[PDB]
Design a protein around this motif. Structure first.
Motif, PDB file in Angstrom:
ATOM      1  N   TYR A  32       0.807  -1.254   0.047  1.00  0.00           N
ATOM      2  CA  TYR A  32      -0.020   0.096   0.206  1.00  0.00           C
ATOM      3  C   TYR A  32       1.045   1.211  -0.109  1.00  0.00           C
ATOM      4  N   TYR A  33       1.882   1.314   0.658  1.00  0.00           N
ATOM      5  CA  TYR A  33       2.812   2.376   0.888  1.00  0.00           C
ATOM      6  C   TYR A  33       3.548   2.646  -0.408  1.00  0.00           C
ATOM      7  N   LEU A  36       0.980   4.321  -2.647  1.00  0.00           N
ATOM      8  CA  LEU A  36       0.963   5.620  -2.118  1.00  0.00           C
ATOM      9  C   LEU A  36       2.100   6.600  -2.753  1.00  0.00           C
ATOM     10  N   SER A  37       3.136   5.883  -2.445  1.00  0.00           N
ATOM     11  CA  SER A  37       4.344   6.430  -2.960  1.00  0.00           C
ATOM     12  C   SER A  37       4.434   6.637  -4.441  1.00  0.00           C
ATOM     13  CB  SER A  37       5.675   5.717  -2.733  1.00  0.00           C
ATOM     14  N   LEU A  39       1.794   6.985  -6.211  1.00  0.00           N
ATOM     15  CA  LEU A  39       0.834   8.325  -6.798  1.00  0.00           C
ATOM     16  C   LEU A  39       1.365   9.553  -6.368  1.00  0.00           C
ATOM     17  N   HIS A  40       2.017   9.668  -5.110  1.00  0.00           N
ATOM     18  CA  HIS A  40       2.829  10.723  -4.949  1.00  0.00           C
ATOM     19  C   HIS A  40       3.739  11.278  -6.000  1.00  0.00           C
TER      20      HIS A  40
END
Lengths: 60, 48
Positions: A32-33, A36-37, A39-40
């Motif tokens: 998940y992280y 998210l990374s 996406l960032h």
């Protein structure tokens, strides 16, 4: 998720099965992280390009 | 001479029509290329 991971990583009493479950949860959290990374980084690419390109590809 | 003239005129007409058809055939590709490149760019953008 992070509260759960912190609560269970410290609990030795969870046993080998509990530790394996916590490890699986942490691995899913790592995936998940990573997402998210990613996406960032895409948002950073949109910021870096600076153009309010009304193209269908622009990060709105 | 009259028979020759009439036959020649008919042959000239037929040959003119054939040349017109050949030029039309030899002179859609652009549209297909545009569509292919558009598809490719849309695929690239979506994948990116």
């Amino acid at each position: 998720i992070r509260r759960y991971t912190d609560q269970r990583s410290l609990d030795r009493s969870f046993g080998l099965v509990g530790q394996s479950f916590c490890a699986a949860l942490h691995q899913e959290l790592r995936e998940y992280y990573r997402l998210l990374s990613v996406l960032h980084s895409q948002l950073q690419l949109e910021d870096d390009q600076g153009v309010n390109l009304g193209l269908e590809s622009s990060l709105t | 001479i009259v028979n020759l003239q009439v036959e020649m005129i008919k042959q000239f007409h037929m040959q003119l029509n054939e040349m017109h058809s050949l030029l039309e055939r030899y002179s859609e590709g652009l549209v297909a290329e545009i569509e292919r490149l558009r598809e490719e760019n849309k695929r690239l953008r979506a994948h990116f």
